[PDB]
Design an enzyme around this catalytic site. Structure first.
Site, mmCIF file in Angstrom:
data_model
loop_
_atom_site.group_PDB
_atom_site.id
_atom_site.type_symbol
_atom_site.label_atom_id
_atom_site.label_comp_id
_atom_site.label_asym_id
_atom_site.label_seq_id
_atom_site.Cartn_x
_atom_site.Cartn_y
_atom_site.Cartn_z
ATOM 1 N N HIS A 1 0.797 -1.232 0.000
ATOM 2 C CA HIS A 1 0.000 0.000 0.000
ATOM 3 C C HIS A 1 0.823 1.272 0.000
ATOM 4 O O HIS A 1 0.231 2.347 -0.111
ATOM 5 C CB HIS A 1 -1.075 0.015 1.055
ATOM 6 C CG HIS A 1 -0.591 0.178 2.434
ATOM 7 N ND1 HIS A 1 -0.672 -0.735 3.383
ATOM 8 C CD2 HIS A 1 -0.148 1.294 3.016
ATOM 9 C CE1 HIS A 1 -0.215 -0.206 4.543
ATOM 10 N NE2 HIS A 1 0.048 1.035 4.356
ATOM 11 N N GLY B 1 2.615 6.521 9.445
ATOM 12 C CA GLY B 1 4.030 6.462 9.099
ATOM 13 C C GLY B 1 4.722 5.213 9.623
ATOM 14 O O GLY B 1 5.855 4.954 9.247
ATOM 15 N N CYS C 1 3.791 2.046 9.201
ATOM 16 C CA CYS C 1 3.640 0.895 8.345
ATOM 17 C C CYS C 1 5.004 0.396 7.862
ATOM 18 O O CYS C 1 5.873 1.247 7.584
ATOM 19 C CB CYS C 1 2.730 1.298 7.193
ATOM 20 S SG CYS C 1 1.098 1.792 7.733
HETATM 21 ZN ZN LIG Z 1 0.301 2.502 5.791
#
Ligand SMILES: [Zn+2]
Ligand SMILES: [Zn+2]
Lengths: 306, 306
Positions: free
Chosen positions: B41, B143, B145
């Protein structure tokens, strides 16, 4: 979102840990520049620890009796000195991994990370606080002496604790990196009892702000209080008195949430008098006091270290 | 002595974190050898996340649209591929700090450390578990992820988790390093509700052994039980059923303490039916389920990592 008891990343400290052996005693040292710092009781036998005279014991040791090993590699000791309850072993090589660093002495209520080590080898990292009675509640087995506590500001490691002692009640005592014990403790195997382990009120309040930001809100109530009224309840529950300084430190969290500090104090007063009734806040059934206001702000904002 | 929720030392993982940016989205990647792994993503806008077609989105990206930065230094992307819900960005330089490593897929109840990062920069380390409903309860802000979870065996890092999603209830979901989500979750901003978050019984029992070793013993009682009788109470309290396999895994802690597993189960049954009555075990007012039997043995014995 979410809120966890979080330690600082430990890599900068991992690069400073070494093993120190003197006679039959092995523990950990901290290698910064060309100095290794370790507890002075490395020079003691189990027998010596009952009533050690460290200046007299230290006279029987030479540089070559301090064996310092960094990984697989031996360091050459070119001097030694006692400073309070630490030894400083001068070595002939500067640690190439030395981070930017400070030595500081922290106040009760401050938090720090501990890198638990054995034989110079890191095992784990956790997060704890200097208690109001100058103990810490750590995890330290035989061989962990010389493990350190620290905080990190961007790239600068502030070393605040070196582990020395477990008291007969299983709580822990140690020094700053100047070798001065926190509290009244000594490096001798004697009767040393801790005082009241009160709860760090300003830290509980910070954590209740963390709870509201992270959507735990059931404990918010319709009440307010005053510092003096709150403090009558703090005293009765073995909480630290709350000061205007503490109110000032909580200002930013109050501004974010729109919950006045004294309103949060009234929520805390209720929780003390009523209990949690089988409910939880941020996964705890106890009011958590090992997050400082600064810790809460940091974790709620996403601050990093290089 | 003492017993703390402890993370693995994070330095080996710190040396693998990088920043990955694609268009306006920045998150973290894991750099091992000449591959950077990150959530797919990264290629999405906030708008895309509502119903993303990742193969179609990915066609509009080239190698030069993935900006990978390791500290101050840019890495050159020479290939990219999607594997399940992760991207693998081939870079022209092997990470010189790559540790010995494995990718593994863990089972609910297993614990691991998380290195929370932002912009490729480590902020903190904590310790958590894969819940029985395949969520984790972390601390992840925008942030974070691409932050990873791991365990260490001596010098080998077993990577088990990469962070992808926060569900609308504030719990977390993510993948193994093959890009397969734990549980039924998907990388889309949609209705995804978690199932029952049961308590990991074998881990509670391990922690009650830890308590006895570390001198908390008030909950020991005069009773025993059977697996089947215990499990009738587990079910009623939203605990995982205890299996003979679990009994076998607790054998070493039973041998150390001399407390038969089913005797400890009877202590746990009492605690469930009676509550703690305002008492604590290892500093908790809740029965703690984020220590595995192996974690307890490790921490009670002093195991290290090089
Ligand atoms: Zn993310
Ligand atoms: Zn010692």
């Amino acid at each position: 979102s979410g809120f966890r008891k979080m330690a600082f990343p430990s890599g900068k400290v991992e690069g400073c840990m070494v093993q120190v052996t003197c006679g039959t005693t092995t523990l950990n040292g901290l290698w910064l520049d060309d100095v290794v710092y370790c507890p002075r009781h490395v020079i003691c036998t189990s027998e010596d620890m009952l009533n050690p005279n460290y200046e007299d014991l230290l006279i029987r040791k030479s540089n070559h009796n301090f064996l310092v090993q960094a990984g697989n590699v031996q360091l050459r000791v070119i001097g030694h000195s006692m400073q309070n309850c630490v030894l400083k072993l001068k070595v002939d090589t500067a640690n190439p991994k030395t981070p930017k660093y400070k030595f500081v002495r922290i106040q009760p209520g401050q938090t720090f990370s501990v890198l638990a080590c054995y034989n110079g080898s890191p095992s784990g990292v956790y997060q704890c606080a200097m208690r109001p009675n100058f103990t810490i509640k750590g995890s330290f087995l035989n061989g962990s002496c010389g493990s350190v506590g620290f905080n990190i500001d961007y790239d600068c490691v502030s070393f605040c604790y070196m582990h020395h002692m477990e008291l007969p009640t299983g709580v822990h005592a140690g020094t700053d990196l100047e070798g001065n014990f926190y509290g009244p403790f000594v490096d001798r195997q004697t009767a040393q009892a801790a005082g009241t382990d009160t709860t760090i009120t300003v830290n509980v309040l910070a954590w209740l702000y963390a709870a509201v930001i992270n959507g735990d809100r059931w404990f918010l109530n319709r009440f307010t209080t005053t510092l003096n009224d709150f403090n009558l309840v703090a005293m009765k529950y073995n909480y630290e008195p709350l000061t205007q300084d503490h109110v000032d430190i909580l200002g930013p969290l109050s501004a974010q949430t729109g919950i006045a500090v004294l309103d949060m104090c009234a929520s805390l007063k209720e929780l003390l008098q009523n209990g949690m009734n089988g409910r939880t806040i941020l996964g705890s059934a106890l009011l958590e006091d090992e997050f400082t206001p600064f810790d809460v702000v940091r974790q709620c904002s996403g601050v990093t270290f290089q």
